[PDB]
Design a protein around this ligand. Structure first.
Ligand SMILES: Clc1ccc(Oc2cnns2)c2ccccc12
Ligand SMILES: [Mg+2]
Ligand SMILES: [Zn+2]
Length: 313
């Protein structure tokens, strides 16, 4: 309980910034995650023996895929840490505990394919879960790991606190289904602009946590350009494999996923920034002003994509 985690000076400082990259050293990621829980939640939230055993089982159940991997898990958890630390007083003890774990768990056992490819392939998980297929599986895998012996990091909570924190985690993980984001953001837009947004309304908190999750999940677009550009290779590597697998089912994939249409990428990024990323962080900055740096970074990268098209890089 007196055993703090410390980072090197550069990481100690950089980690507090939204645009922080967790680095190429896999063996430091678990200490980074624990450092973030201890500062975000307190050194008292989790039994360190249990948290460390949870972290390593969660790492184990991420696959070696180009993008939806252990590094993504921690990257997304760091973005939530930054949001939580810049909005200290707006979130309950349970929400701080639950959301960092939700982020670490949000993509558990991802295979590299969209809900859409699971449905066209007729994957057993598409029969077990008709909507938000991969996201119901991710939450399902989270509960499994929490239920391993020595892995219940919530064991010191009351029965009711426990049901609250698994409910926070379930909503949070489901909300990373980008299909649900559009509607969630429009409702939040309307509530903020007709002034009816109320953070004491549980149904309204749910929506705001949902948007935070979408924000953390898309935070690749909020890094400094060299990080954003290199992550896009990993993102597109998964997309083109899925495209290849669509072709194998005798279905032309959308151009985004067709590796014969690499030319179309920069325009596809534009569409994504304009349709998804900028709207996401605009609405998030309105509800949570201290998250503006995410919007500013996302804007800078939209501009960097415009320069790619114009042949200036
Ligand atoms: Cl740059 C970026 C980040 C996240 C995205 O959403 C995803 C959904 N599933 N895997 S990645 C993007 C989708 C298209 C183009 C760019 C994207
Ligand atoms: Mg996901
Ligand atoms: Zn994700």
């Amino acid at each position: 309980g007196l055993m703090q985690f410390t980072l090197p000076v550069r990481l100690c400082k950089e980690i507090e910034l939204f645009h922080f990259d967790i680095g190429p050293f896999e063996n430091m990621w678990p200490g980074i995650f624990v450092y973030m829980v201890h500062r975000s939640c307190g050194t008292s939230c989790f039994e360190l023996e249990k948290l460390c055993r949870f972290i390593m089982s969660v790492k184990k159940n991420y696959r070696r895929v180009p993008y939806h991997n252990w590094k993504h898990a921690v990257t997304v958890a760091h973005c939530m840490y930054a949001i939580l630390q810049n909005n200290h007083t707006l979130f309950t003890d349970l929400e701080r505990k639950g959301l960092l774990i939700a982020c670490l768990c949000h993509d558990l056992d991802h295979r590299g394919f969209s809900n859409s490819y699971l449905q066209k392939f007729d994957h057993p998980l598409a029969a077990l879960y008709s909507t938000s297929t991969m996201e119901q599986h991710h939450f399902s895998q989270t509960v499994s790991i929490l239920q391993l012996e020595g892995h219940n990091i919530f064991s010191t909570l009351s029965s009711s606190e426990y049901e609250q924190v698994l409910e926070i985690i379930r909503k949070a993980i489901i909300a990373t289904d980008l299909a649900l984001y559009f509607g969630n953001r429009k409702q939040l837009e309307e509530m903020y602009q007709t002034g009816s947004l109320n953070l004491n309304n549980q149904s309204h908190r749910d929506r705001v946590i949902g948007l935070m999750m979408t924000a953390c999940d898309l935070c690749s677009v909020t890094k400094l350009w060299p990080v954003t550009k290199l992550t896009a290779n990993d993102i597109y590597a998964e997309f083109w494999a899925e495209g290849d697998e669509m072709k194998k089912l005798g279905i032309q994939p959308i151009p985004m996923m067709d590796r014969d249409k690499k030319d179309e990428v920069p325009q596809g990024q534009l569409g994504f920034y304009n349709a998804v990323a900028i709207p996401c962080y605009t609405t998030l900055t309105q509800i949570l002003p201290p998250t503006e740096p995410l919007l500013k970074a996302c804007r800078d990268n939209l501009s960097q994509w415009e320069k790619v098209i114009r042949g200036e890089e």
